[PDB]
Amino acid sequence: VPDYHEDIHTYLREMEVKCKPKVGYMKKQPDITNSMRAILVDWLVEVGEEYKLQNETLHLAVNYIDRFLSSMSVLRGKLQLVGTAAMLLASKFEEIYPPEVAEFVYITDDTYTKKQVLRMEHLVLKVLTFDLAAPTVNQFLTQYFLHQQPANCKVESLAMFLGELSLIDADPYLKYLPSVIAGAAFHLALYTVTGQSWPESLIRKTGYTLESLKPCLMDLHQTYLKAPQHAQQSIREKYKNSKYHGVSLLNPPETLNL
Amino acid sequence: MENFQKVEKIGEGTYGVVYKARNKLTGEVVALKKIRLDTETEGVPSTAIREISLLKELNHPNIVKLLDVIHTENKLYLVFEFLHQDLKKFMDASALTGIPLPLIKSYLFQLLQGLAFCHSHRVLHRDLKPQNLLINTEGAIKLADFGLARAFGVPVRTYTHEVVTLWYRAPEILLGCKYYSTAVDIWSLGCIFAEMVTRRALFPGDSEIDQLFRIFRTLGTPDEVVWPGVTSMPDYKPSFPKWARQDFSKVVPPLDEDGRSLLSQMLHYDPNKRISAKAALAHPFFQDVTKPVPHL
Numbered sequence: 387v388p389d390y391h392e393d394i395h396t397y398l399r400e401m402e403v404k405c406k407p408k409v410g411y412m413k414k415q416p417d418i419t420n421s422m423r424a425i426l427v428d429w430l431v432e433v434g435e436e437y438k439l440q441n442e443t444l445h446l447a448v449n450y451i452d453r454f455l456s457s458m459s460v461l462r463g464k465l466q467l468v469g470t471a472a473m474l475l476a477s478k479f480e481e482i483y484p485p486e487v488a489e490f491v492y493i494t495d496d497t498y499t500k501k502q503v504l505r506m507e508h509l510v511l512k513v514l515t516f517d518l519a520a521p522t523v524n525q526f527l528t529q530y531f532l533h534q535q536p537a538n539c540k541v542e543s544l545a546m547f548l549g550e551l552s553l554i555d556a557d558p559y560l561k562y563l564p565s566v567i568a569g570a571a572f573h574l575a576l577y578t579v580t581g582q583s584w585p586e587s588l589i590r591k592t593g594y595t596l597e598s599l600k601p602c603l604m605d606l607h608q609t610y611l612k613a614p615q616h617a618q619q620s621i622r623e624k625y626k627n628s629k630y631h632g633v634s635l636l637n638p639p640e641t642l643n644l
Numbered sequence: 645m646e647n648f649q650k651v652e653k654i655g656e657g658t659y660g661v662v663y664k665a666r667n668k669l670t671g672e673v674v675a676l677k678k679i680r681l682d683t684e685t686e687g688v689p690s691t692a693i694r695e696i697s698l699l700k701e702l703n704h705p706n707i708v709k710l711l712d713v714i715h716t717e718n719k720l721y722l723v724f725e726f727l728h729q730d731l732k733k734f735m736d737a738s739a740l741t742g743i744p745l746p747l748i749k750s751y752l753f754q755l756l757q758g759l760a761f762c763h764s765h766r767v768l769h770r771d772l773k774p775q776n777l778l779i780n781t782e783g784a785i786k787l788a789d790f791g792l793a794r795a796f797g798v799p800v801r802t803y804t805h806e807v808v809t810l811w812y813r814a815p816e817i818l819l820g821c822k823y824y825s826t827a828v829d830i831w832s833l834g835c836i837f838a839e840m841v842t843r844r845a846l847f848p849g850d851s852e853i854d855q856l857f858r859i860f861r862t863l864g865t866p867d868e869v870v871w872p873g874v875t876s877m878p879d880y881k882p883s884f885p886k887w888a889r890q891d892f893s894k895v896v897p898p899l900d901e902d903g904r905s906l907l908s909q910m911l912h913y914d915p916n917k918r919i920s921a922k923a924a925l926a927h928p929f930f931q932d933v934t935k936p937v938p939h940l
């Protein structure tokens with residue numbers, strides 16, 4: 387394990403900057419909105435629950451969608467096709483057995499055809515120039531977790547939770563690198579469960595001081611307070627499972643000592 | 645595609661035929677891996693998605709270079725640097741004479757550097773066997789065929805049923821471990837090392853149980869001292885025969901005291917203690933390494 391940990395961490399920091407979406411892209415989209423995008427991401431959380439997809443697969447699909455909508459305009463009626471191809475590609479790259487194309491066609495409710503989805507798959511590949519090995523919040527969270535003492539797994543779930551939350555809203559979240567979001571999610575979860583705080587280990591590793599996390603943490607802390615209200619409820623319903631120690635039942639802290 | 649002249653077929657390795665071809669304009673000889681798009685049932689296969697995305701990040705003199713991807717409606721063409729042949733065929737033809745020791749050390753030294761480069765870029769190969777190892781006439785050897793390779797930014801979950809080769813499979817995977825790690829690459833590589841040395845596959849098993857018992861018979865049956873945890877592994881049984889650790893001198897006769905020492909480190913039972921590719925490059929065995937060229 388720890389012969390490459392740091393090489394890996396360093397290199398994921400380099401890749402994540404290559405794989406960053408254009409941040410003010412939703413404004414250049416004449417027919418789609420941050421809010422439609424929230425509808426699509428939430429639906430992806432459900433498709434992933436249903437087919438027992440890994441969480442990584444969801445973060446990947448979200449990254450592809452955002453790099454795609456970054457250079458290509460899409461009418462509202464095709465947004466979901468872009469989403470479905472994205473989910474298919476993320477599955478092939480990350481999953482052991484990806485659900486077949488029929489299955490993906492099936493879960494849009496035969497709203498596109500198996501050949502439309504495949505032509506979309508090709509076109510996503512072309513636009514992303516086959517760059518699919520994208521660093522996600524889930525990746526950085528996984529690296530971060532090696533530095534927690536002792537391991538708390540209510541801490542882990544709750545962090546994963548917050549990191550999935552941030553996928554829903556391009557509204558603030560496209561401003562932050564995945565390593566920064568993973569940072570605030572880790573701190574926020576550590577904090578909420580135990581009252582402890584973004585550890586020195588990780589300050590020295592990431593060169594991120596608690597202070598630098600403060601802007602992202604504030605938005606994240608807002609997202610976490612307002613979660614029970616948000617138009618989209620999929621990630622909460624997911625994170626109620628015993629598999630996740632019902633962390634999304636837990637009580638957000640109302641202040642942060644920040 | 646217009647610029648390429650198919651010269652002859654050189655076959656397959658996971659999905660789609662491989663041709664030697666020359667660029668009619670620049671004159672470069674390349675290897676074209678050509679994939680049929682079932683554009684009505686599956687799409688781009690996941691072997692291709694992985695090998696292309698992963699191999700596009702890896703640029704190193706010991707990893708096969710992906711030159712270009714030519715991306716038409718009905719066909720995907722992968723264009724690689726040409727390499728004269730694989731190590732498997734070479735060992736077949738060097739058989740009865742053996743491969744000279746010094747080329748063995750050069751090959752292993754170069755493989756370790758390619759591996760080290762993968763692993764520091766969160767890429768696992770997962771399917772290292774000699775047919776995947778390509779050599780040229782100038783004495784170079786390269787990791788190839790990344791069809792099964794995986795990014796490990798998050799740990800990689802093991803296929804309950806492995807379509808992933810037998811003879812070169814690590815014992816943690818045979819005992820039903822649930823994650824891969826870079827240690828599986830090191831294990832294959834060590835088997836391939838003994839294979840070059842002794843001239844036959846180290847552990848040529850016939851099922852997963854035969855594989856383990858061939859490993860156990862040479863290295864000795866593990867317990868909790870050698871491998872903390874073994875006895876609580878999904879596929880472990882208290883009923884396994886207890887064999888003894890055979891002397892490595894008997895396993896790999898032609899090898900000196902340092903070779904034997906490295907070899908045995910690449911084949912530690914405990915994935916946590918198995919030597920990494922970085923650390924192996926520092927090994928005293930590599931002190932006199934040169935770059936001989938094969939009789940090819």
Ligand SMILES: CC[C@H](C)[C@H](NC(=O)[C@H](CC(C)C)NC(=O)[C@H](CCCN=C(N)N)NC(=O)c1nc(C)n(-c2ccc(Cl)cc2)n1)C(=O)N[C@@H](Cc1ccc(F)cc1)C(N)=O
Pocket residue numbers: 421422423425426429432433436462463465466492493494495497
């Ligand atoms: C039926 C028309 C409404 C107005 C439309 N809804 C949709 O497009 C949604 C989008 C998805 C991502 C939720 N799609 C569907 O409901 C489509 C129906 C196609 C439209 N109906 C027609 N043409 N008769 N069906 C599904 O998505 C669907 N079917 C099933 C089953 N599931 C499903 C859900 C969960 C699981 Cl686990 C498995 C399957 N989803 C919609 O709300 N459009 C948005 C625009 C929009 C488009 C895509 C998008 F992702 C977000 C917004 C708007 N105009 O405000």
